[PDB]
Amino acid sequence: GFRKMAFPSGKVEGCMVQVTCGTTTLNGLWLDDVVYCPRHVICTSEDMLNPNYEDLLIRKSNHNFLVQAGNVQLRVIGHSMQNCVLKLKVDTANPKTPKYKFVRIQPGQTFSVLACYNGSPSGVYQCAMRPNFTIKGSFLNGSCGSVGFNIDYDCVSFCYMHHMELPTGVHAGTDLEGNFYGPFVDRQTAQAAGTDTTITVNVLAWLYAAVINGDRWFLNRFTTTLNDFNLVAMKYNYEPLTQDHVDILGPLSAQTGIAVLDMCASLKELLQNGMNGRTILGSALLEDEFTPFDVVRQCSG
Amino acid sequence: FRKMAFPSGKVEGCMVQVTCGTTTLNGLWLDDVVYCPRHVICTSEDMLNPNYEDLLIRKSNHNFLVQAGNVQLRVIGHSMQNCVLKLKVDTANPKTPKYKFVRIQPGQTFSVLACYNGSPSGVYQCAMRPNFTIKGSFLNGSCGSVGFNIDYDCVSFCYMHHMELPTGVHAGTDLEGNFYGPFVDRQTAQAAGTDTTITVNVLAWLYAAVINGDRWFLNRFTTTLNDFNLVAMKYNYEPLTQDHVDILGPLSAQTGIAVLDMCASLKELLQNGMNGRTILGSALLEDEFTPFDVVRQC
Numbered sequence: 205g206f207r208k209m210a211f212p213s214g215k216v217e218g219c220m221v222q223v224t225c226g227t228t229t230l231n232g233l234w235l236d237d238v239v240y241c242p243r244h245v246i247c248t249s250e251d252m253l254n255p256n257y258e259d260l261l262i263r264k265s266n267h268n269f270l271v272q273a274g275n276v277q278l279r280v281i282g283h284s285m286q287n288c289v290l291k292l293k294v295d296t297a298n299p300k301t302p303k304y305k306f307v308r309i310q311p312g313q314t315f316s317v318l319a320c321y322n323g324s325p326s327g328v329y330q331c332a333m334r335p336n337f338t339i340k341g342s343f344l345n346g347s348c349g350s351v352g353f354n355i356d357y358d359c360v361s362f363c364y365m366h367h368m369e370l371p372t373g374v375h376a377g378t379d380l381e382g383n384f385y386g387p388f389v390d391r392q393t394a395q396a397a398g399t400d401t402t403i404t405v406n407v408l409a410w411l412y413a414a415v416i417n418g419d420r421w422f423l424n425r426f427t428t429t430l431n432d433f434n435l436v437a438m439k440y441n442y443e444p445l446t447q448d449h450v451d452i453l454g455p456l457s458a459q460t461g462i463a464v465l466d467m468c469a470s471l472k473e474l475l476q477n478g479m480n481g482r483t484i485l486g487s488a489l490l491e492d493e494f495t496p497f498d499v500v501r502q503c504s505g
Numbered sequence: 506f507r508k509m510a511f512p513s514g515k516v517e518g519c520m521v522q523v524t525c526g527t528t529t530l531n532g533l534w535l536d537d538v539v540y541c542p543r544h545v546i547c548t549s550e551d552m553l554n555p556n557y558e559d560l561l562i563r564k565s566n567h568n569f570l571v572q573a574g575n576v577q578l579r580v581i582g583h584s585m586q587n588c589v590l591k592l593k594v595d596t597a598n599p600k601t602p603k604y605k606f607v608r609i610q611p612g613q614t615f616s617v618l619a620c621y622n623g624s625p626s627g628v629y630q631c632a633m634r635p636n637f638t639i640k641g642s643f644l645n646g647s648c649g650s651v652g653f654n655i656d657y658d659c660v661s662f663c664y665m666h667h668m669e670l671p672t673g674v675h676a677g678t679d680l681e682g683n684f685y686g687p688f689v690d691r692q693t694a695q696a697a698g699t700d701t702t703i704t705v706n707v708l709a710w711l712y713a714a715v716i717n718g719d720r721w722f723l724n725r726f727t728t729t730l731n732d733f734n735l736v737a738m739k740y741n742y743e744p745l746t747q748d749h750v751d752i753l754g755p756l757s758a759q760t761g762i763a764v765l766d767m768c769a770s771l772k773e774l775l776q777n778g779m780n781g782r783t784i785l786g787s788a789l790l791e792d793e794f795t796p797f798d799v800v801r802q803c
Contacts, residue, residue, distance in 0.1 A: 205673060207642055208507065212618060212625035214514030318512065327509035327802070328628055342507060342802055373717070489788055505621065505644045 205485065206413065206494060206502055208330040210316040211355040218300030221278065222323030223292065223349070224270040231320040231349030232271065233362065235301050239271050239278070239292040240380060241349045242367050243285055244390050252392035261285055272323060287382030288367065288390050303359040306380040310448065311335045312403040314495050315352040315363050322346060332493045335443045336398040337386025338374035341366070370397055402442045403492040405449035408467050410491045412456035413499040414484045421482060423462065426469045433468040440475045452496045506713045506785045508630040508793070509802055510616040511655045518600030521578070522623030523592070523649065524570040531620040531649030532571065532592070535601050539571055539592040540680060541649045542667050543585055544690050552692035561585050572623060587682030588690050589665065602660045606680040609663040611635045612703045614795050615652040617664070619643060632793035635743060636700040637686025638674040641666070670695055702742045703792040705749040708767050709799040710791045712756040714784045716803055721782060726769045733768040740775045752796045
């Protein structure tokens with residue numbers, strides 16, 4: 205019944221440009237009179253093992269940057285670096301600039317990715333930030349600078365800019381202020397993600413969704429403390445819950461009348477006893493890629 | 506490996522709200538014409554056996570309220586093509602993309618832009634099921650949402666949403682207003698024919714699993730096309746045509762796995778199951794990726 209559903213991408217499509225240094229092209233995000241893109245656009249292959257980005261930037265001038273919306277050049281009139289992002293001031297304000305914010309998401313939150321190549325969008329899909337600060341994208345060469353976002357009312361919240369792939373095939377990147385999610389750095393080195401864990405808050409959202417749809421065999425008469433639940437959760441490679449997780453489950457708890465800690469007791473029993481050949485929402489597997497917000501969208505609209 | 510939808514901006518620029526009485530749904534505004542489901546002209550007294558020709562002749566242009574955002578468009582004419590109402594308006598949409606209307610085949614995929622009150626809400630990839638239903642996420646007010654593919658800068662519209670079935674799947678028309686499947690735009694509980702699994706798509710997805718390093722299900726056995734098809738049909742899988750085998754060529758080459766070798770692996774999965782294992786995260790074989798879908802994303 206539930207599917208991965210992305211936000212409509214049009215407001216973000218109208219902000220995508222390409223940024224080229226020499227023969228190296230990646231994507232950038234054009235908002236008002238600033239283009240945002242990964243700073244490694246200024247790298248050569250020789251620079252990539254461990255670039256001195258500050259040194260590489262001093263040698264760059266505005267006239268070294270080719271910014272294009274489609275085939276139309278956007279003149280660069282200033283440049284600066286903010287953490288791992290390059291900001292290129294341009295001489296034209298993007299007429300399609302939406303209302304927007306830059307947000308830094310928490311692990312477990314979902315967002316839409318507009319996968320782009322040479323400034324042109326190819327596809328849109330929903331991603332979850334894993335607890336180890338990686339995402340399972342579909343990113344090919346040339347996808348850097350593609351962004352992740354959520355849309356609230358008229359307003360686009362940009363939360364992710366793509367920078368790299370890890371040996372295991374997962375992906376890593378920054379917020380739009382250039383700060384990486386997780387311990388990663390933008391160098392052509394092999395870097396390891398932490399062991400991943402299951403996104404507990406999303407599993408709980410899934411159980412609430414099951415209840416909303418009349419599937420509630422797993423509810424019990426008991427409760428737990430948050431600390432007790434977290435200590436058990438960790439033994440099953442589940443993420444510990446935070447206070448923010450408890451809070452964002454508030455609406456679903458209200459919709460069902462099931463206290464968060466009571467659902468935690470139900471989940472604890474599932475982890476300790478298994479499913480015993482039973483299904484939930486038609487699956488023998490628990491799903492962790494739907495947030496409480498995702499559930500409410502697809503259940504209540 | 507995840508489902509990927511087409512970027513929806515070209516379609517978002519065409520969505521409007523259409524209202525008649527106490528019924529509101531979505532319309533598609535292309536040039537100076539707005540397309541929408543004709544059941545916008547129904548009421549509760551009509552929905553069970555609506556004589557749409559009688560209902561439509563009794564309507565005036567001024568009974569139709571069309572809003573592009575905060576701007577009302579003036580309806581200067583109306584007509585009906587099968588189950589789609591066509592409202593001529595006095596302004597052309599400058600955001601009209603290059604477009605075509607197509608009727609898709611069962612097994613083909615398309616992107617759905619789900620809308621409510623003329624406002625886009627979500628985008629996702631669907632397949633036209635062999636029984637001509639689609640497994641959508643459509644709520645009250647989603648009617649007139651459209652499905653589409655994009656090729657070059659050209660949008661091919663293939664689906665407009667009309668109804669839900671008691672099993673939770675959905676049914677709709679092409680943009681000429683002809684339903685996919687044996688369904689009717691009346692307020693009745695309708696069942697579909699027996700569904701079948703889209704075999705060529707399952708094979709494409711197994712190839713995707715292989716390209717992604719998942720390969721526990723491969724085997725050295727092989728099979729003929731006909732013997733595979735006999736087993737497929739026993740499990741309510743579509744038989745594989747030679748065209749379908751041809752279409753899988755590029756994925757065969759890329760991975761070096763003969764199509765009929767992948768058929769032999771799928772056969773083993775049908776007869777044995779997956780025994781707790783998963784493929785690309787799923788406990789179930791997925792059939793809503795076409796070979797084209799897999800290739801483009803690889």
